[PDB]
């Protein structure tokens, strides 16, 4: 499912991401935008053979199990395919664990590189939240 900007913002808010761990909603929407372009089915394989899954491009080396990643830890205790669902609940619960891991949203390279320090409020502008 390819989400609309305001649509995703509302679902993320409903799921308790607005200001979760200090990061406003604009940060999460911006992150999803550059990580997956709002597409729940996005996947990207990496050089270390792990793969990033879903709307927030969660990695198979530590967060989920895809059955094909060397030394995966599966911290979110879920099969990676669950992150591709049209229902973002699994992705949100796992992202909450990742962002709490010590490095905050810097865990998401696209966030650090394209969202960090920018006017993230623009991502929820015009939405009825």
Coordinates of N, CA and C in Angstrom, one line a residue:
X1 N 0.9 -1.2 0.0 CA 0.0 0.0 0.0 C 0.9 1.2 0.0
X2 N 0.6 2.2 -0.9 CA 1.3 3.4 -1.0 C 0.4 4.5 -0.2
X3 N 0.9 5.0 0.9 CA 0.2 5.9 1.7 C 0.2 7.3 1.1
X4 N -0.8 8.1 1.5 CA -0.9 9.5 1.2 C -0.2 10.1 2.4
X5 N 0.4 11.3 2.2 CA 1.2 11.9 3.3 C 0.4 12.2 4.6
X6 N -0.8 12.8 4.4 CA -1.7 13.0 5.6 C -2.2 11.8 6.2
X7 N -2.5 10.8 5.3 CA -3.1 9.5 5.7 C -2.1 8.8 6.6
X8 N -0.8 8.7 6.2 CA 0.2 8.1 7.0 C 0.4 8.9 8.3
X9 N 0.4 10.2 8.3 CA 0.6 11.0 9.5 C -0.4 10.6 10.5
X10 N -1.7 10.5 10.1 CA -2.8 10.2 11.0 C -2.7 8.8 11.5
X11 N -2.2 7.8 10.8 CA -2.1 6.5 11.3 C -0.9 6.4 12.2
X12 N 0.1 7.1 12.0 CA 1.3 7.1 12.9 C 0.9 7.8 14.2
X13 N 0.1 8.9 14.1 CA -0.3 9.6 15.3 C -1.2 8.6 16.2
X14 N -2.1 8.0 15.5 CA -3.0 7.0 16.1 C -2.2 5.9 16.9
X15 N -1.1 5.6 16.3 CA -0.2 4.5 16.8 C 0.8 5.1 17.9
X16 N 0.6 6.3 18.3 CA 1.5 6.9 19.3 C 2.9 7.3 18.9
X17 N 3.2 7.6 17.7 CA 4.5 8.1 17.3 C 4.8 9.6 17.5
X18 N 3.8 10.4 17.5 CA 4.0 11.9 17.7 C 4.7 12.1 19.0
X19 N 5.9 12.6 18.9 CA 6.7 12.9 20.0 C 7.2 11.7 20.8
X20 N 7.2 10.6 20.1 CA 7.6 9.4 20.8 C 9.1 9.5 20.9
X21 N 9.6 9.4 22.2 CA 11.0 9.6 22.5 C 11.6 11.0 22.0
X22 N 10.7 12.0 22.0 CA 11.1 13.3 21.7 C 11.1 13.7 20.2
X23 N 10.7 12.8 19.3 CA 10.6 13.1 17.9 C 9.2 13.4 17.4
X24 N 9.0 14.6 17.0 CA 7.6 15.0 16.5 C 7.2 14.2 15.3
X25 N 6.0 14.3 15.0 CA 5.4 13.5 13.8 C 6.0 13.8 12.4
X26 N 6.4 15.1 12.2 CA 7.1 15.5 11.0 C 8.3 14.7 10.7
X27 N 9.1 14.3 11.8 CA 10.3 13.5 11.6 C 10.0 12.1 11.1
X28 N 8.9 11.5 11.6 CA 8.5 10.1 11.2 C 8.0 10.1 9.8
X29 N 7.2 11.1 9.4 CA 6.6 11.2 8.1 C 7.8 11.4 7.1
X30 N 8.7 12.4 7.4 CA 9.8 12.7 6.6 C 10.7 11.4 6.4
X31 N 10.9 10.7 7.5 CA 11.7 9.4 7.4 C 11.1 8.4 6.5
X32 N 9.8 8.1 6.6 CA 9.0 7.2 5.8 C 9.1 7.6 4.3
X33 N 9.0 8.9 4.1 CA 9.0 9.5 2.7 C 10.4 9.1 2.0
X34 N 11.5 9.4 2.7 CA 12.8 9.1 2.0 C 13.3 7.7 2.1
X35 N 12.7 6.9 3.1 CA 13.1 5.6 3.2 C 12.4 4.7 2.3
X36 N 11.1 4.9 2.2 CA 10.3 4.0 1.3 C 9.4 4.6 0.3
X37 N 9.3 6.0 0.4 CA 8.5 6.8 -0.5 C 7.0 6.4 -0.2
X38 N 6.7 6.1 1.1 CA 5.4 5.8 1.6 C 4.8 4.4 1.2
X39 N 5.7 3.5 0.7 CA 5.3 2.3 0.2 C 5.6 1.2 1.2
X40 N 4.5 0.5 1.7 CA 4.7 -0.5 2.7 C 5.5 -1.8 2.2
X41 N 5.4 -2.0 0.8 CA 6.1 -3.1 0.2 C 7.5 -2.9 -0.2
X42 N 8.1 -1.8 0.1 CA 9.5 -1.5 -0.3 C 10.5 -2.5 0.4
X43 N 11.5 -3.0 -0.4 CA 12.5 -3.8 0.2 C 13.8 -3.4 -0.5
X44 N 14.9 -3.4 0.2 CA 16.2 -3.1 -0.4 C 17.3 -4.0 0.2
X45 N 18.0 -4.7 -0.6 CA 19.0 -5.7 -0.2 C 20.3 -4.9 0.1
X46 N 21.1 -5.3 1.0 CA 22.3 -4.6 1.3 C 23.6 -5.5 1.0
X47 N 24.7 -4.9 1.0 CA 26.0 -5.7 0.7 C 26.3 -6.7 1.7
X48 N 25.9 -6.5 3.0 CA 26.2 -7.5 4.0 C 25.1 -8.7 3.9
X49 N 24.3 -8.7 2.8 CA 23.3 -9.7 2.6 C 22.0 -9.5 3.4
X50 N 21.9 -8.5 4.3 CA 20.7 -8.3 5.0 C 19.8 -7.5 4.1
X51 N 18.5 -7.3 4.5 CA 17.5 -6.6 3.6 C 16.7 -5.7 4.5
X52 N 16.3 -4.5 4.0 CA 15.5 -3.6 4.7 C 14.1 -3.7 4.2
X53 N 13.2 -3.7 5.2 CA 11.8 -4.0 4.9 C 10.8 -2.9 5.3
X54 N 9.8 -2.7 4.3 CA 8.7 -1.8 4.6 C 8.8 -0.3 4.6
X55 N 7.8 0.3 5.1 CA 7.6 1.8 5.2 C 8.8 2.5 5.9
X56 N 9.4 1.8 6.9 CA 10.5 2.4 7.6 C 11.8 1.7 7.4
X57 N 11.8 0.8 6.4 CA 13.0 0.1 6.0 C 13.8 -0.5 7.1
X58 N 13.1 -1.3 7.9 CA 13.7 -2.0 9.0 C 14.6 -3.2 8.6
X59 N 15.8 -3.2 9.1 CA 16.9 -4.2 8.7 C 16.8 -5.6 9.4
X60 N 17.0 -6.6 8.5 CA 16.9 -8.0 8.9 C 18.1 -8.6 9.8
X61 N 19.2 -7.8 9.8 CA 20.3 -8.3 10.7 C 20.0 -8.3 12.2
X62 N 19.2 -7.3 12.6 CA 18.9 -7.2 14.0 C 17.4 -7.2 14.4
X63 N 16.6 -6.6 13.5 CA 15.2 -6.5 13.9 C 14.1 -7.5 13.6
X64 N 14.3 -8.2 12.4 CA 13.3 -9.1 12.0 C 13.9 -10.3 11.4
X65 N 13.1 -11.4 11.3 CA 13.6 -12.6 10.7 C 13.1 -12.9 9.3
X66 N 14.1 -13.0 8.3 CA 13.7 -13.3 7.0 C 14.2 -14.6 6.5
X67 N 14.9 -15.3 7.4 CA 15.4 -16.6 7.1 C 16.5 -16.7 6.2
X68 N 17.1 -15.6 5.9 CA 18.2 -15.6 4.9 C 19.3 -14.6 5.3
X69 N 19.4 -14.2 6.5 CA 20.4 -13.2 7.0 C 21.3 -13.8 8.0
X70 N 22.6 -13.8 7.7 CA 23.7 -14.3 8.5 C 23.8 -13.6 9.8
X71 N 23.6 -14.3 10.9 CA 23.7 -13.7 12.3 C 22.6 -12.7 12.7
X72 N 21.4 -12.9 12.1 CA 20.3 -12.0 12.5 C 19.9 -12.2 13.9
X73 N 19.6 -11.1 14.6 CA 19.2 -11.2 16.0 C 17.7 -11.3 16.3
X74 N 16.9 -10.8 15.3 CA 15.4 -10.7 15.4 C 14.8 -10.1 16.8
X75 N 15.3 -8.9 17.1 CA 14.9 -8.2 18.3 C 13.4 -7.9 18.4
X76 N 12.8 -7.6 17.3 CA 11.3 -7.3 17.3 C 10.5 -8.5 17.3
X77 N 11.1 -9.7 17.2 CA 10.5 -11.0 17.2 C 9.4 -11.1 16.2
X78 N 9.6 -10.8 15.0 CA 8.6 -10.9 13.9 C 9.3 -11.3 12.6
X79 N 8.5 -11.9 11.7 CA 9.1 -12.3 10.4 C 9.1 -11.0 9.6
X80 N 10.1 -10.7 8.9 CA 10.2 -9.5 8.1 C 9.1 -9.2 7.2
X81 N 8.4 -10.2 6.7 CA 7.2 -10.1 5.8 C 6.1 -9.3 6.5
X82 N 6.1 -9.4 7.8 CA 5.0 -8.7 8.6 C 5.2 -7.1 8.5
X83 N 6.4 -6.7 8.1 CA 6.6 -5.3 8.0 C 6.2 -4.7 6.6
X84 N 5.7 -5.6 5.8 CA 5.2 -5.2 4.4 C 3.7 -5.1 4.3
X85 N 3.0 -5.4 5.4 CA 1.6 -5.3 5.5 C 1.0 -3.9 5.3
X86 N -0.2 -3.8 4.9 CA -0.9 -2.5 4.6 C -1.2 -1.9 6.0
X87 N -1.2 -2.7 7.0 CA -1.4 -2.3 8.4 C 0.0 -2.0 9.0
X88 N 0.2 -0.8 9.4 CA 1.6 -0.5 9.9 C 1.9 -0.8 11.3
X89 N 1.0 -1.4 12.0 CA 1.2 -1.7 13.4 C 2.6 -2.4 13.7
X90 N 2.9 -3.5 13.0 CA 4.2 -4.2 13.3 C 5.3 -3.2 13.0
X91 N 5.3 -2.5 12.0 CA 6.4 -1.5 11.7 C 6.5 -0.5 12.7
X92 N 5.4 0.0 13.2 CA 5.4 1.0 14.3 C 6.0 0.5 15.6
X93 N 5.6 -0.7 16.0 CA 6.0 -1.3 17.3 C 7.5 -1.6 17.2
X94 N 8.0 -2.0 16.1 CA 9.4 -2.3 15.9 C 10.2 -1.0 15.9
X95 N 9.8 0.0 15.2 CA 10.4 1.3 15.1 C 10.5 1.9 16.5
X96 N 9.5 1.7 17.3 CA 9.6 2.2 18.7 C 10.8 1.6 19.5
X97 N 11.0 0.3 19.2 CA 12.2 -0.4 19.9 C 13.5 0.2 19.3
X98 N 13.6 0.4 18.0 CA 14.8 0.8 17.3 C 15.2 2.2 17.8
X99 N 14.2 3.2 17.8 CA 14.5 4.6 18.2 C 14.8 4.7 19.7
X100 N 14.5 3.7 20.5 CA 14.8 3.7 21.9 C 16.2 3.0 22.2
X101 N 16.8 2.4 21.1 CA 18.1 1.7 21.2 C 19.3 2.5 21.6
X102 N 19.2 3.8 21.7 CA 20.4 4.6 22.1 C 20.8 5.7 21.1
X103 N 20.6 5.4 19.8 CA 21.0 6.4 18.8 C 19.8 7.2 18.2
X104 N 18.7 7.0 18.8 CA 17.5 7.7 18.3 C 17.2 7.5 16.8
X105 N 16.7 8.5 16.1 CA 16.4 8.4 14.7 C 17.6 8.3 13.8
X106 N 18.8 8.4 14.3 CA 20.0 8.3 13.5 C 20.2 6.9 12.9
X107 N 19.4 6.0 13.4 CA 19.3 4.6 13.0 C 18.9 4.6 11.5
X108 N 18.1 5.6 11.1 CA 17.6 5.7 9.8 C 18.5 6.7 9.0
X109 N 19.4 6.1 8.2 CA 20.3 6.9 7.4 C 19.6 8.0 6.5
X110 N 18.4 7.7 6.0 CA 17.7 8.8 5.2 C 17.2 9.9 6.1
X111 N 16.9 9.6 7.3 CA 16.5 10.6 8.3 C 17.6 11.5 8.6
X112 N 18.7 10.9 9.0 CA 19.9 11.7 9.3 C 20.4 12.5 8.2
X113 N 20.3 12.0 7.0 CA 20.8 12.7 5.8 C 19.8 13.7 5.1
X114 N 18.5 13.5 5.3 CA 17.6 14.3 4.5 C 16.5 15.0 5.4
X115 N 16.3 14.5 6.6 CA 15.3 15.1 7.5 C 15.9 15.8 8.6
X116 N 17.0 15.3 9.2 CA 17.6 15.9 10.4 C 18.0 17.4 10.2
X117 N 17.5 18.2 11.1 CA 17.8 19.6 11.0 C 17.0 20.4 10.0
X118 N 16.1 19.8 9.3 CA 15.3 20.5 8.3 C 13.9 20.9 8.9
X119 N 13.1 21.6 8.2 CA 11.8 22.0 8.7 C 10.8 20.8 8.6
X120 N 11.0 19.8 9.4 CA 10.1 18.6 9.4 C 8.6 18.9 9.5
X121 N 8.3 20.0 10.1 CA 6.9 20.4 10.3 C 6.1 20.5 9.0
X122 N 6.9 20.7 7.9 CA 6.3 20.9 6.6 C 5.6 19.6 6.1
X123 N 6.1 18.4 6.6 CA 5.5 17.1 6.3 C 4.1 16.8 6.8
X124 N 3.7 17.6 7.7 CA 2.3 17.4 8.3 C 1.5 18.6 8.0
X125 N 2.0 19.6 7.3 CA 1.3 20.8 7.0 C 0.1 20.5 6.2
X126 N -1.0 21.2 6.5 CA -2.2 21.0 5.8 C -3.0 19.8 6.2
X127 N -2.5 18.9 7.0 CA -3.2 17.7 7.4 C -4.2 18.0 8.6
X128 N -5.3 17.3 8.6 CA -6.3 17.4 9.7 C -5.8 16.4 10.7
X129 N -5.1 16.8 11.7 CA -4.6 15.9 12.8 C -5.1 16.2 14.2

